[PDB]
Design a protein around this ligand. Sequence first.
Ligand SMILES: Nc1nc2c(ncn2[C@@H]2O[C@@H]3COP(=O)(O)O[C@H]4[C@@H](O)[C@H](n5cnc6c(=O)[nH]c(N)nc65)O[C@@H]4COP(=O)(O)O[C@H]3[C@H]2O)c(=O)[nH]1
Ligand SMILES: Nc1nc2c(ncn2[C@@H]2O[C@@H]3COP(=O)(O)O[C@H]4[C@@H](O)[C@H](n5cnc6c(=O)[nH]c(N)nc65)O[C@@H]4COP(=O)(O)O[C@H]3[C@H]2O)c(=O)[nH]1
Lengths: 122, 152
Amino acid sequence: FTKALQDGYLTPAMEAEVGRLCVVAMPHKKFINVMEEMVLTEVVSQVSKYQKTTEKQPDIADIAAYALNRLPPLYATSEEGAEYQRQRASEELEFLIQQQVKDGLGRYFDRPQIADRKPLEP
Amino acid sequence: MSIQEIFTKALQDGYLTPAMEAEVGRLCESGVDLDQGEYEALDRLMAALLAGDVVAMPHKKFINVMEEMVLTEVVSQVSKYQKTTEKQPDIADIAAYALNRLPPLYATSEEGAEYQRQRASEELEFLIQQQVKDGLGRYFDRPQIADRKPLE
Ligand SMILES: Nc1nc2c(ncn2[C@@H]2O[C@@H]3COP(=O)(O)O[C@H]4[C@@H](O)[C@H](n5cnc6c(=O)[nH]c(N)nc65)O[C@@H]4COP(=O)(O)O[C@H]3[C@H]2O)c(=O)[nH]1
Ligand SMILES: Nc1nc2c(ncn2[C@@H]2O[C@@H]3COP(=O)(O)O[C@H]4[C@@H](O)[C@H](n5cnc6c(=O)[nH]c(N)nc65)O[C@@H]4COP(=O)(O)O[C@H]3[C@H]2O)c(=O)[nH]1
């Protein structure tokens, strides 16, 4: 508590530590990657077919993250900025987004789980 | 985009898309409801979400590790300016500028998040510093862009 009082900002290594017990604070709410929204929409649109089968729906996080690492980041902090990032993705990146979601889906099916892997909360 | 319709489709298709998550988000804003069929629909969606019959978008389950690196570098760079200036710098503005000019480092595991910090440490350290500096620079140049509503 004393350190952030002097260094003047609540820093990510000493911000997620108030997630271990569970002066400016880090703004995570105020910015987002608009590509995340576009990719999830395309992931749901592609994995829909499998929802009428018996078991094993494909993991969306795995597919979205693969794809997000192979697309341009679209980080905005305003509603206007977000609309610009949506218009760009919808008008310029539509085929890029499909291929990567499809690559991701095919990667998931090839290895649905990966050994020695603990998933991640905040 | 009636909440009855949302409940309908969500249950049928077995997801809640980002468009649907947004309409349910905005719809929770202290306004009028049917208070009965709008209210009931939201409560059924709830029960279905909790059962696992509507899967919502796993937002909490993947993260761009690069946001941690960037946020830590911005604090490092803005820290020396704290006393100099009423209105501290906009951290969000600076990090978003930089994040748009850096590789994404998304992960789903703890081990993945570790490989991505490793990559950032050993290869991207200077690149990150330079993008945060350019972001910080653009902030001091133009601390307030006109005609923006912030997100929350
Ligand atoms: N066609 C068009 N697109 C526009 C316009 N203004 C913004 N955009 C687009 O929207 C993205 C997000 O803008 P933002 O939400 O203001 O989000 C901005 C903002 O928070 C910050 N930033 C950038 N420049 C400045 C600046 O001069 N001052 C401050 N304070 N923040 C800035 O960095 C974020 C990312 O900026 P970018 O990577 O440039 O990415 C921008 C850019 O692609 C515009 O007038 N026309
Ligand atoms: N040097 C090194 N780096 C490693 C290793 N394993 C993972 N990484 C790195 O860690 C990142 C995050 O991996 P993740 O959290 O497993 O998160 C993964 C996971 O959610 C998913 N994914 C990728 N490949 C597969 C796969 O074959 N099956 C499944 N189910 N998901 C996958 O996509 C996410 C992003 O994958 P990438 O873009 O490749 O991003 C990977 C990659 O950059 C390793 O053995 N060595």
